[PDB]
């Protein structure tokens, strides 16, 4: 390395500044109670030691920083290229997806800030987890290889797990009959368990696909993979249809498990049952804006050269999903289950639309 | 066609490995039969050798069977260990003959 | 990923382009000055003859039996409940036999394999002998599949569910026509391609193509309706 | 994700093939149909399929009685002498 | 088979000890030497 | 009434007869494994014999 | 105090010898199945570069190679002619 | 003391670097003849394999043999076939002997030929 | 790492243990053991033990093991730059310092939240 | 969590004979994603010669003395973005672990 | 007796199958998941050596890190199982009768059902 | 038994064939078979042991 170009890392400066500001404010808030009263100090009033911070300002901070990121995009300039060793892509479509996810996150955060003053049932760590998720998902949009996409998706999955962990468990209510008796809820454990194991399965299958993509092509860059697959189709050199079919199948099934799509939709019902409404709010926006959009762009844009193997698989899944849910959605009796099945049905419809698009 | 007289589903499956003859339902609320309880009580009563089991009629008070208060307590505790249950304090002190004990054990679902 | 690729080949286009043909004679012809063993071994071309009715029926039965075995392995056996006495007897049999698992597997999978074999053979004989000469291919597929699946649902499953068997047969026939008979997502040519055969020179073809473009200009709504402003 | 580095920090053996394939792809108006030779060379460098086919053919030929003895090589000079002498 | 192949190589040695440049004839096969020096059995 | 509404109603009811409303862990893992294995089987069966 | 007898007397060779022999037989059979039938069939090396192929896939691959060679030759010839014409009409 | 010791360690490292420059010069002096012998032996083995392959494959037609022995369209790049690539010991081999020789040469004499 | 000699040396270790086993067996000729009631029973400061199998620890320090699992990964990721530090540049130096800073920040957060002690 | 080895009294035979044995048999029958690769005994070892070749010109131009060079290259030159990502992931995981303990 | 590539692909998928097969005890599933990550580690190293690719060794150490974080989460989730009234054997957390368990028996917490 | 005798014969022939092809029909330049190969000092790169 004889020279480190600014164009290799120019995009990372606002993200690093936002991360530093966020975490510095978090660490300083962690010790907001410590305030020494010296022997020569006088207190006009008696200090209150039992406090409950309202996280509104934290949300406000998020909005402000998120808004500033919007500004950085509005005044953006450069070339259409790759940066950081061809690990990230800078072109119009990726930046537009980045801007779209930012603005939608900002709108959701604004409404959350409006709602939080009616009743405070959430902690500061909850909105710190939200801060991290909203800081990191658009970089998932900016991915250029399956390697970096995988690592970003595990980072965001850990942030989502952190958000699920800090859900409020016990509440102050008007039920005075439950003192001196043990009542078991078990919703927290189910949410953690199912999220954990779905993440495990998706991660191992994605790593498997990455390994075989390196074996088949020599890189996980989208353009190289597509060019190699198309040129091999023209040349008739690599005629192992079984390996290509298995790679496509493993990637698709990993994403099915990750997204909780109709064949594997059951655990999402339990996750929704154990979650608060604000968590479902944020999870739905994160799921549709980022996870499902990237799942779609896999067949549409990122791995289009493999559509001749993808379509049939998708078709089968779609059929199964419909015939799996046309009766199961009619024996539910829970509001959270209703919301989750709404999301599942819309996901199946969008998958059918993807099948139509790739034709 | 939907048959409302058929109420079976996967929730009601009641096949257990231990029972070669499958049970009627999945509620484990089966009580002991009357003759089994009487035979087991008679087995417990064999240790108290002052009681004649030949023409023993179960409606007699414990005293007229030859058992004083301490023997009554020992016999009740022995039956209680035999069926692996506990008698509440009011039930333990309210027993006057073996018929009441038999009825109580019959009504119990935890008796084994 | 291709389905029924041999029956959808455009023979004229393939022959014009020089592409290998899936209907070419894939046969072995023994010659003299050869030993008696290679004469017998070269008879294996019988299994390659797709016009052999017995071979086709046996292959269809094999495919049906394989599908039935797979369904039993994945969804059939695990859903059904076995009495504890029967399971205990089976496990005792495994204890007193060196390969007792294979016998249990045979006993468990024989009905499904047999049913699949029968269904595949009957389906092939029903499709190839009855509905192969109907003019409307889509309607023939729909009707044949609906009737066959209704009968299969009545026999193999409770006969009170035959309506759902008919509906499933209709849907399966539609899917089969869309992807097993037609060629969507699996095309061996390019849309709009053609082959020329006349002795016309390049000038004549260019003149005809100019005429065709002039005619094609009339497909625009603004051009045909005269709704274009002056540029 | 193609780095061009070998397992000891050197240069990947298929780097020139990759470089020529990319140079062809970035210069042609129809890269898929106009860079078949370069992509085939890179694919042969990566998957050694042609060599494996050659090895299969050589084993199938060696399974017969075609070859009896091979010429001997003397270290002093780059010459092969027959096994007979 | 390898005993047979080893036997052919050693007998060709004593054959060329007296008949240099000729072909060894045993059984129904002919052992010949190529110009590059390869010994091959042809039938 | 029957052939238009109650056929679908009874189909849904009889299908729900074989559904656990509450997910258990073993069923979840078994569903994932079955999906993997038999999606692979159906794809390879279509590739080979269809 | 290695105490070989006290350590190896309970489980000398295999806890369930019959089951250990079933792993070996299955492993042997699967290795034979993969190495002798399935892998050679999938590799399709039997008729590779054969002058008189019978398998459809080999014929398709040969057609692909011949077509690509013809395309490359024709394009190179046309490009050379066009470049020569441009150079000759530039001077 | 920490700063001074770090400086001293850097001093010995730089001295070793100078000695390494000298040793690299000596190795450069030695290299070409080793390279020539290596290339000659490699080409002898390759010629043996070429003649063997030609003799084996000429029975199925002369055009078949050259089609089977052809790997690359472009002939100005050398990419020799390898089942695997070495990584350990700077992509080298430490033991070039059988496992029996590996386990016996550490105790028993007569296994090493004493390169002098 | 090692070589094929390690397995042979382990077998030699087993033979040496066999030598000790022979010595211990031979030593049995010079004493007798008389069967008694409490001789083969558990020793608890001279009295009888009241439990055999259910001897459960509280394990009220699991956060230490949780953090150890992560910091082992931290240090194993740190090794390569230390091994090849003689060839550092801007990027390598910045990445190494940022990684160490992240480790320090995580430790500081743990100290602030007081998860490095014993809990009831 | 399990001081004694006592565990759930489970019978593995039922699921083995109902689901796992036939599924395993089918998977073994149809699964193979090894296109071309030969055992070491497929061809005589004497037909291989590339392990003997040595190139001495980069031998004296090579200053590396350890086996950490590819890892260093990838973690601090090429995949440094993923290195930073894994560091941030571990920090967030520590924070989430503390919150889970709370 | 089997090629390493096919062997290791099969080993990974067999590990997943065995993970699904075994009774649903959280600690057992944690251990089997760790084994799955290690199988991925070995497969990545094998292909990195075969194809002379340096990114797959990175995959090995990144697998180490991801598996470590996942194991920490699993330990915490098991200790959370402690505090909630749940059994580490999930099959004992429901009333669905299971023929695979010898001694599954749950009944209502009532001493008797009928009084008159 | 007869089949045991046949197995013993095949095993002995395998063992002897392996040893014979290691001792002869094989260049002997590295020390592989102790007490059968020479244990002398070699001054040239290629000396038969
Ligand atoms: C096929 C050839 C063969 O040996 O078949 C015997 C095999 C079972 O033999 P068996 O007579 O039942 O032996 C019972 C045991 O003695 C006693 O039964 P068990 O409970 O000890 O286990 C029986 C069986 C239990 O079967 C299983 O566990 C099925 C496989 C479960 C999924 C995991 C894959 C297997 C991983 C280990 C083996 C890898 C092989 C490659 O496992 C085995 O027999 C071990 C080898 C299984 C090879 C398949 O039959 C079939 O596989 C069919
Ligand atoms: C009789 C059974 C043993 C046998 O066949 O030995 C002959 C065997 C020669 O068989 P071979 O495979 O033709 O040897 C030539 C290979 O190139 C030799 O290849 P290698 O020694 O490099 O690799 C084979 C080695 C692989 O070594 C390892 O895997 C290292 C760790 C070993 C523990 O395997 C062994 O040392 C054990 C299996 C033989 O000799 C040895 O293994 C060397 C030690 C001498 C035999 C000691 C045991 C038998 C003594 C009484 C004989 C009557
Ligand atoms: C509803 C399902 C049943 C529908 C009606 C029955 C259909 C099949 C009736 C028999 C058809 C038949 O014999 O065809 C002659 C064909 C003749 O085929 P072949 O193989 O004998 O002769 C070669 C084909 N030709 C005649 C063109 C030379 O099939 C048979 O004779 C045997 C068929 C069953 C094999 C098992
Ligand atoms: C270990 C190989 C075991 C092979 C046999 C096997 O799998 O048996 C299964 C068996 C279980 O199956 P089993 O119960 O059927 O027993 C069959 C095995 N024998 C022959 C022993 C009866 O498990 C064992 O044998 C347990 C062995 C435990 C050994 C633990 C001590 C350490 C071993 C070496 C580790 C070295 C690491 C560090 C190296 C560098 C420093 C020195
Ligand atoms: C048992 C002890 C070793 C003797 C039996 C083995 C044969 C032998 O003598 O080999 C000579 C071995 C090996 O010597 P060597 O390897 O130098 O000579 C043999 C050389 N070749 C193989 C090339 C022919 O040397 C010794 O045994 C040295 C004497 C050891 C005596 C015991 C020392 C510890 C006492 C407490
Ligand atoms: C060197 C190792 C020598 C081991 C000798 C056998 C161990 C031994 O003495 O065991 C004593 C035991 C007990 O022998 P014993 O009971 O006859 O002698 C005990 C000592 N006196 C004579 C005082 C009563 O012997 C055996 O176990 C017999 C082993 C086979 C002979
Ligand atoms: C090689 C790497 C070199 C890195 C150099 C970093 C220099 C940091 C300088 C400050 C160190 C503070 C150490 C500390 O814990 O001090 C105790 C202090 C008490 O709080 P207070 O009284 O407010 O004092 C503020 C600063 N003394 O603070 C505390 O008790 C901690 C809580 C206060 C908030 C700050 C915590 C540290 C934040 C570090 C930056 C994180 C940036 C984002 C990372 C992602
Ligand atoms: C999912 C979407 C996939 C893509 C969309 C297309 C879907 C349909 C594709 C298959 C079409 C089809 O089935 O065609 C019938 C086929 C025709 O075969 P043909 O080409 O004429 O001849 C070759 C040799 N027979 O002939 C056959 O395939 C023969 C067998 C057909 C009949 C099979 C009957 C069912 C077999 C499985 C039963 C399973 C249950 C068994 C146990 C029940 C309970 C006891």
UniProtKB/TrEMBL annotation, chain A:
The keyword Mitochondrion applies. The keyword Membrane applies. This is Ymf65. Residues 194-356 form the NADH:quinone oxidoreductase/Mrp antiporter transmembrane domain. The chain crosses the membrane at residues 5-27, 57-75, 95-112, 124-141, 147-166, 187-215, 235-257, 277-303, 309-330, 337-358. Keywords: Membrane, Mitochondrion, Transmembrane, Transmembrane helix.
UniProtKB/TrEMBL annotation, chain B:
Residues 35-109 form the Carrier domain. Its main location: mitochondrion. It is found in: Mitochondrion. The keyword Translocase does not apply. GO terms for cellular component: mitochondrion. The keyword Transit peptide applies. Keywords: Electron transport, Fatty acid biosynthesis, Fatty acid metabolism, Lipid biosynthesis, Lipid metabolism, Mitochondrion, Phosphopantetheine, Phosphoprotein, Transit peptide, Transport. GO terms for molecular function: acyl binding; acyl carrier activity. Carrier of the growing fatty acid chain in fatty acid biosynthesis. Belongs to the acyl carrier protein (ACP) family. This is Acyl carrier protein. It comes from Tetrahymena thermophila (strain SB210). The lineage of its organism: Eukaryota, Sar, Alveolata, Ciliophora, Intramacronucleata. The chain holds residues 27 to 138 of 138 of the full protein.
From TrEMBL, chain E:
This is DnaJ domain protein. It comes from Tetrahymena thermophila (strain SB210).
From TrEMBL, chain L:
The chain crosses the membrane at residues 1-16. Keywords: Membrane, Transmembrane, Transmembrane helix. The keyword Membrane applies. The keyword Transmembrane helix applies. This is Transmembrane protein, putative. It comes from Tetrahymena thermophila (strain SB210). The lineage of its organism: Eukaryota, Sar, Alveolata, Ciliophora, Intramacronucleata. The chain holds residues 23 to 71 of 71 of the full protein.
